[PDB]
């Protein structure tokens, strides 16, 4: 069994192909604590032992998900989170070969060449043996690693000429990933990552202009205000105050301009691309500005955003 | 193995003869960058090391080809571009003798004598040793150099009397090369080069009158408008506006007159020729004006334009 | 008060004239972050508000200065960086008229005419109102814009004939700026910029041959090795190994040849100049090669490199 794994900063997504031919997907949390979870036998608990330390699944509010850092990708918890996903996936316990991920700037070095040191370190991490109290665990055999953003653009790359060059612009909640890839994924010419640029720049500007609480509830409100920014009636309906509307609107417009400018300034470091692709949760917010700035023709511009499984699905298409 | 090489300002064209007797041709790009191209093993990459510096093939849009200058002919990139062409030609890696080119005004000095200094410098350039990461490279042994425009007229020269004198007028996209050559290529009497005169004079006048974008797409449109200038119906069909047609037409006619005048004024510096030949991408645009101006008889006038391999093929015929 | 401002890619330099007649200069960093800097009242902090977003001075190691791109010249941070320089200059807070800069290829378009669109966009940028927490800020009134490299050659231009033509060759750490300017700065005939050609080509070749760390400390070592390249004793003293010396020396010599060739090939696109000037941090490295290549007489060749304030001082001389 070959399982494709998107072990990102907020959760674990799996994709694999069953005996017949059906493609299955699964998502699991990244919430684990460094201690034994006790049960009086009333609720289900997962107690693990990895290198020496013990760990347990720590179920928390789907509203308090913690975003992890780069170092997390080489930790014990990373390994436990993957094994836990396999255990709750539905797959039968067994030996499995896997493909996991490393962030763009971790997979590649500043010379745009694959950083062998990091990749090998990622692979060695899954060699640690794991046990589960009260049951058995999967056994990870072969481990391959893929960079994060690029697989999401494979479907498009597949139809490009190897001499063609695709500029993949991936704007997320808190980060920006840009990479120039040769047609059919026949090579990489340049990679660029910014960890302080994302949709949050606009979201925080909105939360601040409304004095919204820190609750995730205000996050949804802010998300909605951004989504429906051009529909003044939607807003009047939401924010009850013509004055608040004006205030939130210009704070939002100001934040978006700064967003567009910062993204374009980074794009100014790339050159030689023939096709452009914009993806990520913030794709809608910069779509127009990049199209105008790159002056690329419509048949050479792509917006393949579909779902949260885009990445792992792309990984699947590449190495199924 | 003897390989004939047209290492021009926009690409590299090769021609050689196989074991049996078949004549093969090849074209390769001039796009290389001064850095290591990284690959995660997904796409093909060519990483070279020449004098000390490293270089790599930089595949770019067949729409963004960069035209190189005279200095390029003596650079490291020139050498890398040739070795890269050999590597993708199909030829088996081995030692090879070659014949390359130098622009007309680089091959000859203002006294119409071969500029030994430049020629030797061109030859020494290919002495630099080159390595390719992950594979071996050809070894360049003997190097001969030929001037650019003149070989394209060899087939015609071959049938002229050594006492005859051929005036080769070669109008390209951005340059004009004129040379007076003794029959059978038994000597050169006069050379002349103009780097600011070419078909672009007419093409830019057309692009400007239509407000066409900088895209290569408008370049094709402009090329077509020039080609079909005498067919008003083709135009109406293309440019949808009777007023635009009139405007583009007179801008075009004005640009062509200026073109003809400037070319003729240069021809006024030549004398003593007995036969005339017009070649290059702009040959069709000045054919009539030169025939009328030189008053040469039809059996003494040639228009041997056939294809992009005219030059390298001529080089082949001369030294095969 | 009129303040001349060199808001470049690595810092901000100011120059102005005081009440009496003394000329003062100032340099300030370009390091700012998109967030509020907190202080328990122990250290000084600068918290700004510009369009809507907030920003703060982010003091960092004088060893980790980040080089900015073209887009930066039209950003909010650009405006904040200028206001911050004014606030730390010593000047009294007040209304001020200013002159700022745009890179050569941003100030001029591919037709060598001033790009009005960019210039106006640069000017409008400084119209955004700014506030500082705990104090007041300068008020920017009139804004004029000047191209980057050309003002540094004004002192020389002043003594040339308007019919004379000066070729200004400005080689920097990572870029090459070339421009042909009519005497007394009475017009511009041609501009050329290359963003991938600079002294770094030689510096990186040296760092690589010594396996020097990424630290700025190795950068100084590499700079010194280049500066004293012709003094073998200085080197033996520095690099302790006769074998390392030979290795670094030929890598360096190879990198310099490639540098010279690439610069000359670009110079081959210019013509009609009567005087030549070589400036920038890499001026010493190409001085001889350009003099030999252009064959210009000594009284027509200038090397006015003096200091980091050359540019802003030239701006001052032009519009004081």
For residue C258, which residues of chain B lie inside 8 Å, CB to CB?
Answer: 34, 51, 53, 75-76
Residue closest to B10 by CA, chosen among B46, B88, B62: B62
Contact A280, A305 (CB under 8 A): yes
For residue A265, which residues of chain C lie inside 8 Å, CB to CB?
Answer: 68-72, 75
Which residues sit opposite C192 in a β-bridge?
C178
For residue B69, which residues of chain C lie inside 8 Å, CB to CB?
Answer: 265-266, 268-269
Cβ–Cβ below 8 Å for C250 and B75? no
Q: A105 is written with which tokens? A: 């700037």
Distance of alpha carbon B102 from alpha carbon B108, whole angstroms? 9
Q: Are residues C103 and C158 in the same domain?
A: yes
Residues contacting residue A310 through CB under 8 Å, at least 6 positions apart: A152, A279, A304
User: ∠ CA C249-C252-C255 to the nearest 5 degrees?
Assistant: 150
Residue closest to A175 by CA, chosen among A282, A27, A293: A282
CA distances from C140 to A20, C9, C96, C129, C147 (A): 71, 21, 5, 9, 20
* Closest partner CB to B51 (pick from C196, C254, C269): C254
Distance of alpha carbon B45 from alpha carbon B54, whole angstroms? 13
For the beta carbon of residue C184, count every other beta carbon within 10 angstroms. 16
Instruction: Look at strands C47-49 and C54-57 and give their pairing.
Output: antiparallel
Is A111 in the C-facing interface, judged by CB distances under 8 Å? no
Distance of alpha carbon A298 from alpha carbon A291, whole angstroms? 9
Contact C83, C169 (CB under 8 A): no
Q: C195 is written with which tokens? A: 């963003």
Is A272 in the C-facing interface, judged by CB distances under 8 Å? no
* Closest Cα in chain B to A113: B38
Q: Are residues C148 and C230 in the same domain?
A: no
CA distances from A244 to A214, A227, B291 (A): 19, 17, 79
* Closest Cα in chain B to A295: B215
Distance of alpha carbon C224 from alpha carbon C266, whole angstroms? 28
* Closest Cα in chain C to B51: C254
Q: How many domains does chain A have?
A: 2
Q: Which CATH number characterizes residue A228's domain?
A: 3.30.420.40
Q: C13 is written with which tokens? A: 């330099």
Contact B60, B35 (CB under 8 A): no
Contact B183, B166 (CB under 8 A): yes
Residues contacting residue C186 through CB under 8 Å, at least 6 positions apart: C162
The 10 Å CB-count burial string (b at 16+, else e) for A259-278 is bbbbbbbbbeebebbbbbbb
Distance of alpha carbon B214 from alpha carbon B191, whole angstroms? 34
Instruction: Tell me C298's DSSP state.
Output: G
Q: Read out DSSP for C221-262? A: HHHHHHHTTT-HHHHHHHS--HHHHHHHHHHHHHHHHHHHHH
Q: Which residue range(s) make up the domain with B65?
A: 1-163+304-320
Contact C281, C172 (CB under 8 A): yes
Q: C156 is written with which tokens? A: 């020389």
Place of tokens 């072990």: A7
| CA atoms within 13 A of residue C46's CA, in its CB half-sphere | 21
For residue B34, which residues of chain C lie inside 8 Å, CB to CB?
Answer: 196, 201, 258
The 10 Å CB-count burial string (b at 16+, else e) for C227-261 is eebeeeeebeebbeeeebbeebbebbebbbbbbbb
Q: A252 is written with which tokens? A: 């939002």
Which residues sit opposite A167 in a β-bridge?
A180, A276
* Closest Cα in chain B to C267: B71
Contact C149, C179 (CB under 8 A): yes
Distance of alpha carbon A73 from alpha carbon A78, whole angstroms? 6
Residue closest to C178 by CA, chosen among C165, C191, C197: C191
Residue A252 CA to chain centroid, in angstroms?
Answer: 24
Is A241 in the C-facing interface, judged by CB distances under 8 Å? no
Q: Are residues B262 and B313 in the same domain?
A: no
Q: Which phi and psi (to 5°) does residue B6 adopt?
A: -100, 85
* Closest partner CB to B59 (pick from A108, A114, A163): A163
Sign of CA dihedral A241, A244, A248, A254: positive
Residue closest to C156 by CA, chosen among C299, C288, C7: C299
| 3 state DSSP class of C318 | helix
Q: Are residues B157 and B36 in the same domain?
A: yes
For residue B88, which residues of chain A lie inside 8 Å, CB to CB?
Answer: none
Q: B211 is written with which tokens? A: 């407000």
Instruction: Tell me C212's DSSP state.
Output: -
Q: Are residues B215 and B242 in the same domain?
A: yes
Q: Are residues B185 and B267 in the same domain?
A: yes
Q: Looking at chain A from residue 242 to 261, which residues have their Cβ under 8 Å from any Cβ of chain B?
A: none
Q: Looking at chain C from residue 81 to 100, which residues have their Cβ under 8 Å from any Cβ of chain B?
A: none
| 3 state DSSP class of C133 | coil
Q: Are residues C106 and C176 in the same domain?
A: no
Cβ–Cβ below 8 Å for B59 and A162? yes
Q: Are residues A16 and A48 in the same domain?
A: yes
Cβ–Cβ below 8 Å for B64 and A272? yes
Q: B244 is written with which tokens? A: 């635009």
Residue closest to A127 by CA, chosen among A88, A78, A90: A78
For the beta carbon of residue B291, count every other beta carbon within 10 angstroms. 16
Instruction: Tell me C62's DSSP state.
Output: T
Instruction: Look at strands A165-171 and A176-182 and give their pairing.
Output: antiparallel
Instruction: Tell me C59's DSSP state.
Output: -
Q: Mutate which of B53, B80, B193 to disrupt the C interface (most C C-beta within 10 Å)?
A: B53
| CA atoms within 13 A of residue C59's CA, in its CB half-sphere | 7
Distance of alpha carbon A144 from alpha carbon A58, whole angstroms? 28
Distance of alpha carbon B99 from alpha carbon B320, whole angstroms? 10
Q: C58 is written with which tokens? A: 């982010």
User: ∠ CA A273-A275-A276 to the nearest 5 degrees?
Assistant: 100
Contact B190, B184 (CB under 8 A): no
Q: Are residues A52 and A183 in the same domain?
A: no
| 3 state DSSP class of C84 | helix
Distance of alpha carbon A185 from alpha carbon A165, whole angstroms? 9
Residue closest to C312 by CA, chosen among C95, C11, C96: C11
Cβ–Cβ below 8 Å for C69 and A266? yes
Across the A:C interface, residue pairs with CB atoms under 8 Å apart total 40
Q: Read out DSSP for chain B? A: -EEEEEE-SS-EEEEEE-SSS-EEEEEE---EESSPPP-SSSS---EEESSSSEEEE----TT-PPPP-TGGGGSHHHHHHHHHHHHHHSPPSSEEEEEEEE-HHHHB-TTSSB-HHHHHHHHHHTTS--EETTB---EEEEEEEEESSGGGGHHHHHTS-TT-EEEEEEE-SS-EEEEEEEGGG--EEEEEEETT-STHHHHHHHHHHHT--SSHHHHHHHHHHHHTTT-HHHHHHHS--HHHHHHHHHHHHHHHHHHHHHHHHHHTT----SEEEEESTTHHHHHHHHHHHHT--GGGEE-----TTHHHHHHHHHH-
Residue closest to B78 by CA, chosen among B41, B113, B110, B121: B121
Residues contacting residue B281 through CB under 8 Å, at least 6 positions apart: B171, B172, B173, B199
Q: Are residues A9 and A110 in the same domain?
A: yes
Distance of alpha carbon B21 from alpha carbon B104, whole angstroms? 31
Distance of alpha carbon B222 from alpha carbon A174, whole angstroms? 46
Distance of alpha carbon A170 from alpha carbon A279, whole angstroms? 5
Chain breaks after residues in chain A, where C lies over 2.5 Å from next N: none
Instruction: Tell me C215's DSSP state.
Output: S
Cβ–Cβ below 8 Å for A188 and B43? yes
User: ∠ CA A175-A178-A180 to the nearest 5 degrees?
Assistant: 165
Distance of alpha carbon C77 from alpha carbon C97, whole angstroms? 19
Q: Are residues C280 and C314 in the same domain?
A: no
Q: Which phi and psi (to 5°) does residue B275 adopt?
A: -135, 155
* Closest partner CB to C269 (pick from B34, B69, B75): B69
Instruction: Look at strands B139-147 and C139-147 and give their pairing.
Output: unpaired
Q: C314 is written with which tokens? A: 């030239």
Contact C106, C71 (CB under 8 A): no
Residue A273 CA to chain centroid, in angstroms?
Answer: 24
Is B70 in the C-facing interface, judged by CB distances under 8 Å? yes
What is the SS3 assignment for C266-278?
A: HHCCCCCCCEEEE
Strands ordered across the beta sheet of B131-132: B32-33, B54-57, B47-49, B131-132
Cβ–Cβ below 8 Å for C261 and B34? no
Which residues sit opposite A100 in a β-bridge?
A145
**C-alpha torsion B284→B289→B290→B292, nearest 10:** 130
Instruction: Tell me C65's DSSP state.
Output: P
For residue B76, which residues of chain C lie inside 8 Å, CB to CB?
Answer: 258, 261
This structure was determined by: cryo-EM
Q: Read out DSSP for chain A? A: -EEEEEE-SS-EEEEEE-SSS-EEEEEE---EESSPPP-SSSS---EEESSSSEEEE----TT-PPPP-TGGGGSHHHHHHHHHHHHHHSPPSSEEEEEEEE-HHHHB-TTSSB-HHHHHHHHHHTTS--EETTB---EEEEEEEEESSGGGGHHHHHTS-TT-EEEEEEE-SS-EEEEEEEGGG--EEEEEEETT-STHHHHHHHHHHHT--SSHHHHHHHHHHHHTTT-HHHHHHHS--HHHHHHHHHHHHHHHHHHHHHHHHHHTT----SEEEEESTTHHHHHHHHHHHHT--GGGEE-----TTHHHHHHHHHH-
Residue closest to C137 by CA, chosen among C215, C84, C74: C84
- For residue C205, the distance in angstroms to the closest alpha carbon of chain B comes to 7
Q: B258 is written with which tokens? A: 């200026």
**Counting every residue, how long is chain B?**
320
The 10 Å CB-count burial string (b at 16+, else e) for A19-55 is eeeeeebbebbbbbeeeebeeeeeeebbbbbbeeebb
For residue B42, which residues of chain A lie inside 8 Å, CB to CB?
Answer: 185-188
- List Cβ<8 Å contacts ≥24 apart for B10-13: B10/B65, B10/B66, B10/B67, B10/B68, B11/B65, B12/B81, B12/B82, B12/B84, B12/B85, B13/B308, B13/B309, B13/B311, B13/B312
For residue A167, which residues of chain B lie inside 8 Å, CB to CB?
Answer: none
Cβ–Cβ below 8 Å for A108 and B58? no
Residue closest to C206 by CA, chosen among C243, C263, C173, C253: C253
For the beta carbon of residue B163, count every other beta carbon within 10 angstroms. 10
Q: Are residues A133 and A197 in the same domain?
A: no
Q: Mutate which of A202, A254, A294 to disrupt the C interface (most C C-beta within 10 Å)?
A: A254
* Closest Cα in chain A to C214: A110
Distance of alpha carbon C156 from alpha carbon C164, whole angstroms? 12
Is A266 in the C-facing interface, judged by CB distances under 8 Å? yes
- List Cβ<8 Å contacts ≥24 apart for C8-13: C8/C101, C8/C148, C8/C311, C9/C67, C9/C68, C9/C69, C9/C72, C10/C65, C10/C66, C10/C67, C10/C68, C11/C65, C12/C81, C12/C82, C12/C84, C12/C85, C13/C308, C13/C309, C13/C311, C13/C312
Distance of alpha carbon B242 from alpha carbon B38, whole angstroms? 53
**C-alpha torsion B75→B80→B85→B87, nearest 10:** 160
Sign of CA dihedral B88, B91, B94, B97: negative
The secondary structure element, H or E, covering residue C5 is strand C2-7
Q: Looking at chain A from residue 184 to 223, which residues have their Cβ under 8 Å from any Cβ of chain C?
A: 196, 201, 205, 209
Q: Looking at chain B from residue 14 to 53, which residues have their Cβ under 8 Å from any Cβ of chain C?
A: 33-34, 51-53
Contact C171, C278 (CB under 8 A): yes
User: ∠ CA C117-C121-C126 to the nearest 5 degrees?
Assistant: 155
């Amino acid at each position: 069994m070959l399982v494709f794994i998107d072990d990102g900063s907020t959760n674990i997504k799996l994709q694999w192909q069953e005996s017949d031919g059906t493609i299955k997907q699964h998502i699991s949390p990244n919430s684990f604590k460094r201690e034994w979870a006790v049960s009086f036998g009333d609720k289900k608990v997962f107690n693990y032992t990895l290198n020496g330390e013990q760990y347990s699944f720590d179920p928390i509010s789907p509203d308090a998900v913690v975003t992890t850092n780069i170092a997390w990708q080489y930790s014990d918890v990373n390994v436990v989170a993957v094994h836990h996903a396999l255990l709750t996936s539905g797959l039968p316990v067994s030996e499995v070969d896997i493909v996991c991920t490393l962030p763009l700037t971790e997979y590649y070095d500043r010379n745009n060449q694959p950083n062998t040191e990091n990749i090998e370190r990622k692979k060695a991490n899954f060699r640690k043996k794991i046990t589960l109290n009260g049951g058995d665990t999967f056994t990870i055999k072969d481990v391959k690693v893929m960079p994060e953003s690029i697989p999401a653009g494979y479907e498009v790359l597949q139809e490009l000429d190897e001499l063609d060059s695709l500029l993949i612009i991936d704007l997320g909640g808190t980060t920006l990933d840009i990479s120039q890839v040769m047609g059919k994924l026949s090579g990489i010419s340049k990679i660029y990552g910014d960890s302080s640029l994302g949709v949050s720049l606009v979201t925080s500007a909105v939360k601040d202009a409304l004095s919204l609480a820190r609750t995730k509830g205000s996050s949804y409100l802010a998300d909605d205000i951004i989504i429906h920014r051009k529909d003044n009636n939607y807003l009047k309906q939401r924010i009850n105050d013509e004055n608040k509307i004006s205030i939130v609107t210009e704070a939002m417009n100001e934040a978006l301009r700064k967003l567009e400018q910062r993204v374009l300034n980074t794009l100014n470091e790339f050159s030689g691309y023939t096709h452009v692709m914009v993806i990520g949760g913030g794709a809608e917010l910069i779509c127009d500005a990049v199209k105008k700035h790159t002056q690329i023709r419509d048949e050479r511009f792509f917006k393949t955003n579909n779902s949260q499984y885009d990445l792992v699905n792309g990984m699947y298409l590449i190495g199924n």
